[PDB]
Every structure is written in C-alpha cells, then in structure tokens.
Amino acid sequence: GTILIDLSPDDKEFQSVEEEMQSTVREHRDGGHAGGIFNRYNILKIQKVCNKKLWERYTHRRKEVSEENHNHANERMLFHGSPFVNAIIHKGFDERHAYIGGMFGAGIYFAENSSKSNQYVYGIGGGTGCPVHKDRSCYICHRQLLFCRVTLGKSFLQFSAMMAHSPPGHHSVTGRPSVNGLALAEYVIYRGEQAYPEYLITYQIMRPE
Template sequence: MALLEPLRKHEETYMKIEKKMRETIKSHNNGIPLSDYNIKKISRVVNKDLKRRHDNVKKLILTEMNAKEAELMELYHGSPNAMQIIKDGFSAQYSDNSNMFGVGIYFANFSSKSNQFAWGNMQGCPPHRDRSCSKCVRHLLVCSCFMGNIYRPTAPTRQVPKGFHSVAAEPGVVPSLCYPEFAVLNGDQALPLYLIEYTIVP
C-alpha cells in the first residue's frame, strides 16, 4: 500500500527539494521553453513493500560485489506513470535496447532533463498534445538509486556488460551527451522518495 504525505511549504525538506529543483534547470534543445517551475505540491512517498524490495536488492548486489557499501544517488525521474510507479515500483520491462544505453530505468541529476519525459518520450500533455504546455500539472519523482557496480560508457551501447548493475554516462566522455545520464538495470534499485506536482513557467 502506497501513501503520499504532503509536505508543508515552510518545512525544511520541502524548501530543500524546491531549491534543488530550481537550481537544476538547464537549457535543452527540446522545444520546451522553461525558465522556472510553479510547484503545486511536494509529497513524501511511503510504500513499505517498495522499501523492502529496495533493501533486499541492495543486500543481493552487495553480496554479489563482496562489498559492504556502494554508491547511493538521489536522482530525478519524469513520467506520466508516476502514480503507478509509486504504487508498484519501477520495472525494466517497459524499457528496450533502443535506448542510448540499452534496457534500464533512466534518471537525471538535472530536473529539467527529467521534465522532458513528464508526458513520456517526445509526447505532449494528454489534453493539448503540447510538450511545452504550461497549464497541465506534471509529475516528477525524486528517487534513491542504489547504483551497485557502475558501468561508465565511452559511447552508446545496446547492452551493458555482465557484472554491472547501473550506468553513469558523462558528457565529454560520451560525445553525444550534453548532460549526465544515469540508469539502473533492476527496477527495485530505485526507490521513489518524493512526488513533485508542478507546472512549468515558459
């Protein structure tokens, strides 16, 4: 069972999330004019089943790595299915190897990059079919991503080599990238922490 606990606007956690979201706006060649966010609500995600699954996969990966710890990253994920993800978790079955780094669940450390996928890949809002719509409410998830053994590619690849649990791709290392890109291979490696409901300011 999933619960959403709304944060108060003057709560420290709310202000921290709001500040970071605004600080991670970048310019993208995507036809979506974005100068700011109009944040409607920020809620804490409470789902004990997803937390249990997340803890279990962490233990399995650490055992496989013969390690005591591995990198944990807080990243953004934009999706029209955010409410379903909060309930059921992430699943790689909705991904395919046509993605830049193959099958996986993709995340970003810039809110504006994840905002591009708020309606899906290259999709617009359902009522207006407009990627740059500033009227319809979008959903952005802040997630805790357990990276395990990280693959750091130098070029796009359709399949991550065996023995790796995630991808961390950097611009300058991967020539076609403008901004960092991250992916986990197992959906349970990513735990939704907060749901941000917002509209964009052109």
C-alpha cells in the first residue's frame, strides 16, 4: 500500500526538512557513545511516504483526540529512529515499536532533537552500531530516520532529571529535560494510530573537521 516519492534537493520541501534535521543536532552527554560523533549530517535522500490506509487511520484517531481536547489535536512534526523504520513505513506504528523500558512509560518515543533519534537507529543505546562495521560512530554506512506527524492532544508534562496507557484524561506524555538546558523534549504516545511516518530521511553522520 505504501509508495515513496523522491523529493528534489531544489524543492523547498526537501530544504525545510533538511533544515529541521541539521538545526536540531546537539551534543550528547554520552560523548557520542550511542549515536556517534558529529555536528551535522550528509543528507543522501528525502522521500515522502504515501499510504492511503495508514493516513486514514491517522486522521481518524486525530479527529477523536481533537474532540476530547478544546478542539485541539496538538499536532507536531517529530523525529523517530529505529531498526524497524522499513517496517513502520509499510504497516505503520504499533506496540512492537514501544520502548518497554522507557522512563516515561511503555509507549512509542519521538524526539525534537534529530540527534536524539539518531542514537536509536541501530537499536536501544545504539545496539552494536552498523551491520557492516559494528561501529556506532560509522561515517560510511547509510542511516535512516523518520520525520513524523504526531497527535499529542492533552499532553501530560513530566519533568526529567536529564503498551501502557496515557495518564487519565491525557493523550500523550511530554518528557522535558530539566538539567541539560540545551536538550529538547521527547514525547510518548500509547496508540500507533497517533503518528504517521511522513518522510523517510537517508543520511550519513559527518566526521567533524
């Protein structure tokens, strides 16, 4: 059901998506352990993901959340990295994409910092790094992240010192770092229908000069 349309680097759409990737890189407290060492990406391809059935599943849930709020979907564009990105684009998000061990509960996690999502491309904590070289800081192998449309509705704010249900009357959780003043938020949803994988971004991290 899914089809991928390649965006031209000359298209303003490709260029705004690239800008959101590049401008939300930050340094990580693990010194690059999980995601590698870099300040910016080499973007190789940006594809728009088109699936009628998944889109209708998304907009159907969105209208429901919308109505339970002050007519407010609270829709964001957020990053998601995972070994399962090729499966998500075909069958959608579900409970098997849930982070059982997550600090904000057993749901699906999205990030404002693209570099936070980059830490999960090869698994929790970066797994063992790329398949070919077993290198979490690999500058050669091609990586992929999703840039997703996410319905937050009434989000429960949880300050952080850095499939389950949302707290009563809430549609998601906001995990907001309170120690690192440069770290942006993560968000957790507990229903797969609350996210749509809009763009598939293929890239390399760049070795600093």
